[PDB]
Design a protein around this ligand. Structure first.
Ligand SMILES: [Mg+2]
Ligand SMILES: [Mg+2]
Ligand SMILES: [Mg+2]
Lengths: 222, 226, 196, 125, 233, 204, 195, 212, 195, 196
């Protein structure tokens, strides 16, 4: 019997800062125990200061990103070159996903950018289109390895101020872009050590008011 | 798992990677897959890790008793025969896939063993999920009359192929060289090409960070005098 | 597997390819499928490698113990021991074995034991996945009382075709000659038999 | 297993091992039973050759088989424990299957049956 | 939904300093039966692209007809059909990738794995993969089926990352490809000795080599191998 | 249906400078239903500590079994069993049930009384030994624990620093697992003093 | 069978068990007592597969009664619960396991403390202030989590138990025909004949 | 998941937890399970997250079209029936929903409809849906009165979700409160269950089984 | 849903229907009215799969109300029951059939006779003096076979109905939370608010 | 089925057995499996008898309509029409067809269309259940540019062996010769070909 779905592995991570946002993902593509590619880009600049990744079954992932990029193009045509805001992009992606409710895109989607007040924004989707604005979200193979670490080091969960013994929480002070990138790199370095599908390389796309910048870092290739 | 065995001039060499997995998760990053059956008979195991360790120790134990009974140094063919008959009886349910190598008064030997009891003979062999990557290297560079240095090089290169290309294999290369008329030399972590880079940040917490309800001394000592 | 045994004027010759397979991966390209259970009683193995190795080891043990008590066993006796193991354990075994041997009284004999555990004495026998493709060729080309050179050619040509069409078969062609003169091993490489 | 016939007939029609078992009973401390109109009393002798005994913990001569039946004995002390244990097990088995405690006659008939069995079974005294 | 009947095995490929190389054997299997021995599985499109196909042969012949029709169609009302508006490797791949994903989405796939190799207008090397599921990816080396497990490890020792491509000559690359084909013949039960090889270079163009054979094979060591454990004779 | 995730729970162990630490949650459940918040999963036989995750009936059975065996060991050997030796006994005992196994994930922690060397080890349900230098994890949130330990851990931590590291590793892992939590305990083990600390955590 | 509840208060343990027995289509009985007295100060309630429940309970009862006669001594509730756990832990890897869940309510005369043990058919034991088996806990535990105090009287325990049964009678689809309630304290075991 | 809604003197209280799971893995602790259909109507999320999100914001669009066409606020009866009739068309295809459509109009007063993906549409006073529904029902049934104050009703809803969050493994994170009046709904904050549990334990004296 | 009963006496038809709605684990409602008035002198009760029951009932109601307006005339109970049967007989060979069983109680104003029709989801129609769907008949029919007379008053019918419900409450495993009872006669449809 | 087609110097010859089978019962022992789709374009059928008859009838219709418009079709064209039906309806068909024809420009041509619906132009082709047993024989004995008499002997001997080993094959050997001279039918009975 023919199985229309597959699993290409991969892990992605989106974090929203005060006036910035990052969307990171490893560059390794796999099936079963084989490596297809050590560098296959997974996070994409979609225009209008929006970055996107659809992790899971790569054929469905490429199809969805392609259709959204297309949706941005036609939004400009139909609405006098108006900039597609991150919230509007999110609602649009829901309709793209739910359109195939009974034969779903087998992917976990994350987009990142800035909201209309200039503040950092990340949105997260399930395969059939349910979505949420979030501060911090990992997706894919090693998501379960990364999220607990982020709860602890970004949101300071289970951390209290010394001397008070549980009475006063550690205050949630804002993180710089340099600080976030440090946590992203350590998240993927740790995931690479313990998950077989994570490795080869890490590509990070940073979004500010100035535009979209890229950073690349090597990961272990075993 | 990637394991290989290579014959050379005056002996035989076996090698293995050091990754053990639970599905897609790496359980141990520096696992020891080279097992000793007797001082100069070593084997490497793939498949169910407990089975390869258990079947090695059972036969290794019985081999030692046999050696004492007969006043002779153990033979590789004895280890092979005892391993295959044990595995055949359990009809494949004991998931042990082994490459058995060693030196004895008869000479140097290299065999492999599938979990259902089938054995084969060869000058170069590979087993495990990375066996195809390893065998590709072996089929490209193997020749007759290899030296000790050449065989160690070829064996580790075959494991590296598994490390880099097979997701089931990784970390380090372990080697064991068994030469005729010499002690077997076990080279643990012969290659270390996968050290983790320094982290960007220290995650040492301030003391008093964790909330505590109760503290108490645990009595690990026995009942006291007086 | 492509295996066969052929009786001729001076005795019998066994032939085999050298491929062992787990799926499409060739787990061993230089396998020895011609197995010795007694000095001049050998067999060809097909089916599960575990099963046929286990059976052959037990038969070798049985014939070694027979020899110590009653002297050299006949080829018929060796075939019977194979049959007993294959018939009584038919539910749990996947083995197709050809038994070939040389007596001085009976000369060359061939017995084939298929899956069920039945015995069939024949002038020659073919077995293994590759044998299907050479039933026509072998039936047309076999003659009784051939010479050693003719029999080697018959087996070489037959297994060449079996290898050509069966993906499960390949590598070198191994042969073992059983006569009054003794036991001779032969090997033929791809560059030789592919151009036939 | 050890199968030797230890209890056998003699020319005069006696089984000596059974008769010698009675001699062991003759040696044991005296036990007595008396039934009144609405009670039964069991009396037992304690030999005073043993002082410095701890009477709290020393095995008592009368044993409850159930809450309503008791057993006393004369003879080998170690042997009596085996009969007492078997009787206690049978008492609970009877309650479990018949849903009624044993009658005194039934419990007696069981213990007596065990004793008889050990007079024509191989390898036992 | 169907099952593949007549099938073709591995296709292998890699990049080098001035272009790309691709190869595949000439066998059409019918299960374990090695039925058809003269099947060409590398199909050139123009003078800048070669499409290598594995899997179901009936579906391969269909794809071959689609590519033939694509060349015809591109030439219609196109004065620059042999110049600026010729078919690029990237155009041919994207078209196939579209078809493969559409067919899997109707639950009626073309049961193949495909590698498109070529050189673009600006001289850039093109090498990308697509299969029955519509999955696509690129890499300095690419291989299908058994080739993925055995050829890639060997080819990756020559070109391990992007920066190794300018340091790799056409002689070194072809040598590596030919050796990989020999290894596959040793170890794949559904492979043949006869194969085809194609080189697409930015300077010397498309070189298509037919009727190649696996040579320099090691078999002599087989004579010393006896029994399966204890047998000496 | 899956025996290893009916009841839930986790255990983690770590090494430091002249010390070891072992910790566990306190939950026992019947799938979605929380049943007990006082089900401790760490036991000790002399100076050797054993944590066990998995099917709770087997957790209790194995504790009783190893208490049985380490008591007979001590009577015959006239000394307390060491971590290295006990590790082999756990492995042997699990493998004897190869084709009808206890559905558990044991973890051993302790300091050798003669060499002073810190020791930890882990097992699968059928006996395979994982002897890591750094840390061992087990239970229904083992993935989460691997992620925490891999980033938070550094070698040669002092006892009071190691406490903070292992505590934060457990807590944050448990909060990402539905079947773990409802309290937690941490053991800090030195050559001749052991401190036990109950942690304050969310009760959902 | 269906619903079995337990609550340990200051000085006693209270067990409540449903009265219905259902053979598929019909309710064959509405006065069934799903409990056995193991010893004068220890009571066990039970629920699970038909036949196995009573067979297991009476088997345990027989064994504890045998111990009591042999030693002339009542085992502690903790000791009885451990014996029961081992029997069920043995049973789960048998040819045909006992499909029986139990609650053991006992008053320890040595420590002068009431004790409640919950054990399922796998041999999973926990000591609790209050417990249940099946779906009973899903309806009742939120009420017990709110109102329970360790220093409650027996009368306060019965009132909290009534609130639990009322919630069961409201939200459960099955008619379990009320409950039989029994109290275990220093004076032994007694049945509340009006509930 | 645990979601509830109940009618009382002062309108409707809606209370939900915040947890989303994929097997044993906790995907999110910050899920919005109350869908703001419009400023006057609320819907709860249970079963399929996408099915509930998608079709209840769609419902908001249909309600907006109704009031543009009819120049009048849509009734809760009519709004709930648009959703139930829609999911009934898809019956068999595999939609997963269990929701409470909540509103307060002039003609009806406070009204709650339970709507189901197999087509069920029930009017009622108290509804509770999810894996922790039974726990929340217990607290609701024993403390509910029509004449509750807005302050006490808000607490009862908060306390009932806490009860479920404690016992049900698949419920937790935080509690979201809403109060629905005739002039629209009013949001009454996000309450972390971790902090809320200890606060309620101390102030109420409940959860004596738990050490704090 | 669960239990629906019907009885035709001298001058009226009485329909009794349970109040419970259960969604698997919990009883979501205990006051549900499983009936629809099709016309002033015709009432239909229903039971079957969730959603389909109300959807079918309201669909039938709409159609009969449409006929009533178009012709300014009330269809006879016989005519309504035939329309309903055809709809279900059509439905059973559809892509997704209505899983709904109904009772139709009506008073024919032309013949001055009460009439009770029983129709299952297949479209199987029978006119009866008394009827039921599901397991309801298994418990109640032996009582109705004994006591029923064609010349019974409405009060005698209600008393015989009470005896039927009492037997259901005794021997049925499910708690159906009582019944809503409605009477159909020459004056129309009314609900008995104390039962 | 045992079917084959062989090109030779003067054109092409088709061959077939005459056995149709529903299980082990021979439903027809004198079947004609050599089918005419055009004057000098014939085919051999194997697989489902319903399917291959339906396909052949449609092809005959297509080529009759082709001829009325464009004149005599090529053998390649006939093969393409067969392929189109077999490929596009692969899910619902069980057909293995060999197409053979004679042009004056192209002379004798053979195309084989296996299960998948692929096309393969070959010097000769074999198909059907019985073909497996003669791969070896045919590969060893086929030569290009044989005479008519040699080709008849090659087909007679080949199908004789296929019939001998395959229970599904049997009866008479039918043949159809396609040359410039015209169309000749041949038949060979058991008493003739069994003694070969
Ligand atoms: Mg690797
Ligand atoms: Mg919870
Ligand atoms: Mg025949």
């Amino acid at each position: 019997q023919f199985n229309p779905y597959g699993d290409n592995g991969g892990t992605i991570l989106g974090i929203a800062g005060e006036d910035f946002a990052v969307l990171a993902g490893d560059t390794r593509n796999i099936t079963d125990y084989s490596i297809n590619s050590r560098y296959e880009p997974k996070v994409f600049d979609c225009g209008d200061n929006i970055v996107m990744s659809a992790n899971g079954f790569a054929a469905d992932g490429d199809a969805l990103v392609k259709r959204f990029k297309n949706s941005v193009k036609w939004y400009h045509f139909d609405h006098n070159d108006k900039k597609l805001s991150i919230n509007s992009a999110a609602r649009n992606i829901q309709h793209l996903l739910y359109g195939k409710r009974f034969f779903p895109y087998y992917v976990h989607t994350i987009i990142a950018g800035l909201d209309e007040d200039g503040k950092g924004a990340v949105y997260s989707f399930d395969p059939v289109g349910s979505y949420e604005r979030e501060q911090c979200r990992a997706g894919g193979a090693a998501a379960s390895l990364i999220m607990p670490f982020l709860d602890n080091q970004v949101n300071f969960k289970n951390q209290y101020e010394p001397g008070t013994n549980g009475k006063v929480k550690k205050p949630l002070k804002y993180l710089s872009v340099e600080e976030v990138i440090k946590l992203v790199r350590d998240s993927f370095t740790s995931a690479t050590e313990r998950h077989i599908q994570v490795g080869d390389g890490l590509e990070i796309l940073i979004v500010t008011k100035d535009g979209v910048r890229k950073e690349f870092y090597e990961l272990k290739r075993d | 798992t990637t394991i290989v065995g290579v014959k050379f001039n005056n002996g035989v060499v076996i090698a293995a990677d050091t990754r053990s997995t639970q599905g897609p998760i790496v359980a141990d990053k520096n696992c020891a897959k080279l097992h000793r059956i007797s001082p100069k008979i070593w084997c490497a195991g793939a498949g169910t890790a407990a089975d390869t360790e258990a079947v090695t120790q059972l036969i290794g134990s019985n081999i030692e008793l046999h050696s004492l009974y007969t006043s002779r140094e153990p033979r590789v063919v004895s280890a092979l025969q005892m391993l295959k008959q044990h595995l055949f009886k359990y009809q494949g349910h004991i998931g042990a896939y082994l490459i058995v190598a060693g030196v004895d008064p008869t000479g140097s030997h290299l065999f492999s063993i599938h979990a259902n009891g089938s054995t084969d003979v060869g000058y170069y062999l590979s087993l495990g999920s990375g066996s195809l990557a390893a065998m590709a290297v072996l089929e490209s560079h193997w020749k007759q009359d290899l030296t000790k240095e050449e065989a160690i090089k070829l064996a580790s290169d075959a494991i590296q192929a598994g490390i880099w290309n097979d997701l089931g294999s990784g970390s380090n290369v372990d080697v064991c060289v068994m030469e005729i008329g010499k002690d077997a030399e076990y080279l643990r972590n012969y290659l270390t090409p996968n050290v983790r880079e320094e982290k960007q940040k220290s995650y040492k917490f301030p003391r008093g960070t964790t909330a505590v309800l109760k503290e108490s001394i645990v009595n690990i000592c026995d009942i006291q005098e007086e | 597997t492509s295996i066969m045994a052929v009786t001729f004027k001076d005795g019998v010759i066994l032939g085999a390819d050298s491929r062992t397979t787990t799926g499409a991966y060739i787990a061993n390209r230089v396998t020895d499928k011609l197995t010795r259970v007694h000095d001049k009683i050998w067999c060809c193995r097909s089916g599960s490698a575990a099963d046929t190795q286990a059976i052959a080891d037990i038969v070798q043990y049985h014939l070694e113990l027979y020899t110590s008590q009653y002297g050299t066993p006949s080829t018929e006796t060796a075939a019977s021991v194979f049959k007993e193991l294959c018939y009584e354990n038919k539910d749990n075994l996947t083995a197709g074995i050809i038994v070939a041997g040389y007596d001085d009284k009976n000369k060359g004999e061939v017995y084939t034991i298929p899956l069920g555990g039945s015995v069939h004495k024949l002038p020659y026998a073919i077995a293994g996945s590759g044998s299907t493709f050479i039933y026509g060729y072998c039936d047309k080309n076999f003659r009784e009382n051939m010479s050693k050179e003719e029999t080697v050619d018959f087996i070489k040509h037959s297994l060449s075709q079996a290898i050509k069409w069966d993906g499960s078969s390949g590598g070198v062609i191994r042969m073992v000659v059983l006569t009054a003169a003794g036991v001779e091993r032969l090997i033929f490489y791809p560059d030789e038999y592919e151009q036939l | 297993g050890y199968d030797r016939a230890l209890s056998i007939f003699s020319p005069d029609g006696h089984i000596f091992q059974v008769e010698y078992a009675l001699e062991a009973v003759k040696r044991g401390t005296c036990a007595v039973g008396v039934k009144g109109k609405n009670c039964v009393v069991l009396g037992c002798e304690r030999r005073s050759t043993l002082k410095l005994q701890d009477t709290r913990i020393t095995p008592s001569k009368v044993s409850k088989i159930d809450s309503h039946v008791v057993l006393s004995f004369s003879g080998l002390n170690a042997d009596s424990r085996i009969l007492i244990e078997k009787a206690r097990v049978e008492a609970q088995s009877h309650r479990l299957t018949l849903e009624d405690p044993v009658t005194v006659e039934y419990l007696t008939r069981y213990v007596a049956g065990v004793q008889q069995r050990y007079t024509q079974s191989g390898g036992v005294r | 939904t169907q099952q593949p009947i007549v099938t073709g095995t591995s296709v292998i490929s890699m990049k080098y300093d001035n272009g790309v190389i691709i190869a595949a054997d000439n066998l059409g299997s019918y299960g374990s039966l090695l039925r058809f021995n003269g099947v060409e599985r590398l199909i050139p499109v123009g003078d800048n692209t070669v499409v290598g196909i594995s899997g179901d042969i009936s579906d391969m012949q269909h794809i071959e007809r689609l590519l033939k029709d694509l060349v015809t169609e591109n030439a219609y009302d196109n004065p620059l059909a042999d110049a600026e508006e010729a078919l690029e490797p990237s155009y041919i791949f994207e078209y196939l990738a579209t078809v493969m994903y559409q067919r899997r989405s109707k639950m009626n796939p073309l049961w193949n794995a495909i590698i498109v190799a070529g050189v673009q207008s600006n001289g850039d090397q093109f090498l990308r993969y697509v299969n029955l599921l519509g999955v696509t990816y690129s890499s300095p080396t690419l291989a299908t089926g058994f080739g993925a497990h055995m050829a890639n490890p060997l080819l990756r020792k020559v070109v391990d990352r992007e920066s190794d491509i300018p340091k790799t000559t056409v002689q070194v690359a072809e040598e590596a490809i030919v050796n990989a084909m020999r290894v596959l013949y040793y170890r794949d039960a559904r492979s043949s000795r006869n194969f085809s090889l194609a080189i697409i270079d930015k300077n010397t163009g498309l070189t298509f080599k037919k009727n190649l054979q696996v040579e320099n094979m090691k078999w002599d060591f087989a004579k010393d191998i006896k029994g399966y454990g204890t047998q000496k004779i | 249906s899956d025996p290893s995730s009916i009841n839930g729970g986790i255990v983690v162990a770590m090494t430091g400078k002249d010390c070891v630490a072992i910790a566990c949650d306190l939950r026992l459940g019947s799938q979605s239903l929380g049943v007990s918040n006082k089900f401790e999963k760490i036991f000790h036989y002399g100076h050797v500590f054993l944590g066990i995750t998995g099917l709770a009936t087997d957790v209790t059975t194995l504790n009783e079994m190893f208490r049985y065996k380490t008591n007979l060991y001590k009577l015959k050997e006239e000394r307390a069993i060491e971590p290295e030796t006990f590790t082999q006994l756990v492995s042997s005992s699990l493998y004897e049930r190869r084709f009808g196994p206890y559905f558990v994930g044991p973890v051993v922690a302790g300091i050798n009384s003669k060499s002073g060397k810190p020791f930890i080890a882990g097992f699968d349900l059928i006996g395979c030994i994982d002897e890591a230098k750094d840390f061992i994890v087990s239970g229904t949130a083992s993935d989460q624990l691997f992620g925490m330990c891999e980033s938070l851990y550094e070698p040669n931590l002092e006892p009071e620093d190691l406490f903070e590291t292992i505590s934060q590793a457990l807590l944050n892992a448990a909060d990402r697992d539905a079947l773990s939590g409802w309290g937690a305990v941490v053991y800090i083990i030195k050559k001749d003093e052991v401190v036990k600390r109950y942690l304050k955590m969310r009760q959902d | 069978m269906d619903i079995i509840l337990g609550i340990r208060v200051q000085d006693s343990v209270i067990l409540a068990s449903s009265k219905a027995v259902t053979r598929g289509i019909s309710v064959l009985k509405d006065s069934d007592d799903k409990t056995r007295q193991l010893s004068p100060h220890t009571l066990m309630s039970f629920a699970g597969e038909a036949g196995d429940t009573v067979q297991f309970a009476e088997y345990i009862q027989a064994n504890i009664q045998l111990y009591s006669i042999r030693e002339d001594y009542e085992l502690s509730p903790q000791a009885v619960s451990s014996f029961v756990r081992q029997e069920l832990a043995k049973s789960i890897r048998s040819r045909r396991p006992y499909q029986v869940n139990v609650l053991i309510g006992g008053y320890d005369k040595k420590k002068n403390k009431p004790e409640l043990y919950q054990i399922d058919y796998l041999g999973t034991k926990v000591e609790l202030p209050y417990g249940a088996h099946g779906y009973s806990g899903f309806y009742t535990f939120s009420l017990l989590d709110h109102h329970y105090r360790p220093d409650m009287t027996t009368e306060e325990g019965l009132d909290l138990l009534k609130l639990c049964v009322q919630e069961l009678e409201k939200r459960m689809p099955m008619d379990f025909k009320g409950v039989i309630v029994k109290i275990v304290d220093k004076d032994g075991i007694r049945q509340v004949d009006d509930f | 998941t645990t979601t509830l809604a109940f009618r009382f003197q002062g309108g409707i209280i809606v209370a939900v937890d915040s947890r989303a799971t994929a097997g044993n893995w906790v995907a999110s602790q910050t899920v919005k399970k109350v869908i703001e259909i419009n400023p006057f109507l609320l819907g709860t999320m249970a079963g399929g997250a996408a099915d509930c999100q998608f079709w209840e914001t769609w419902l908001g669009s249909q309600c907006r079209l109704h009031e543009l066409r009819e120049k009048e606020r849509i009734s809760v009866a009519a709004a709930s029936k648009i959703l139930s009739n829609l999911v009934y068309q898809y019956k068999g295809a595999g939609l997963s929903m269990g929701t409470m459509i909540c509103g307060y109009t002039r003609k009806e007063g406070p009204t709650i409809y339970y709507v189901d993906s197999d087509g069920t549409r029930l009017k009622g006073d108290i509804f509770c849906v999810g894996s922790g529904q039974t726990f929340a029902y217990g607290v609701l049934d024993s403390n509910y009165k029509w004449d509750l104050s807005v302050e006490d009703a808000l607490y009862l809803g908060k306390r009932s979700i806490l009860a479920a969050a404690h016992r049900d493994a698949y419920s937790g994170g935080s509690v979201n409160l809403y109060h629905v009046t005739e002039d629209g709904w009013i949001y009454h904050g996000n309450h972390d269950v971790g902090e809320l549990f200890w606060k309620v334990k101390e102030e109420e004296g409940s959860f004596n089984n738990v050490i704090g």
